[PDB]
Amino acid sequence: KETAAAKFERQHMDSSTSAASSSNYCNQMMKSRNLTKDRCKPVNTFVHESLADVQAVCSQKNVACKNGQTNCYQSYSTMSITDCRETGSSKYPNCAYKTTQANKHIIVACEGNPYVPVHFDASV
């Protein structure tokens, strides 16, 4: 029922902040974006750029996706992102995440009309 594009926005977009603030950013966002609902999603990246700038990556550098598909695009410039990863001591339903803020290029898979981001492949 959620479209592929809407799910990417929900899981990866956080334009309201320019960078992860505290070490608690991931616990708060993973919960409020409903990613710790049935289980603890183990890894998740949030992008702190406008939605228009992330959508523009679909017209940037075409590269292969880790899975071998070729609809992946790497942003030309670096972007503010937050990596959220469960700690060794996280346990549904008490999900615990490590927050790591960084500035790097993002790689996303794009599809449809309009051609927008539908999957977050990696960051470099």
Ligand SMILES: [Cl-]
């Ligand atoms: Cl949509």
Ligand SMILES: [Cl-]
């Ligand atoms: Cl939701």
Ligand SMILES: [Cl-]
């Ligand atoms: Cl991710």
Ligand SMILES: [Cl-]
């Ligand atoms: Cl994804």
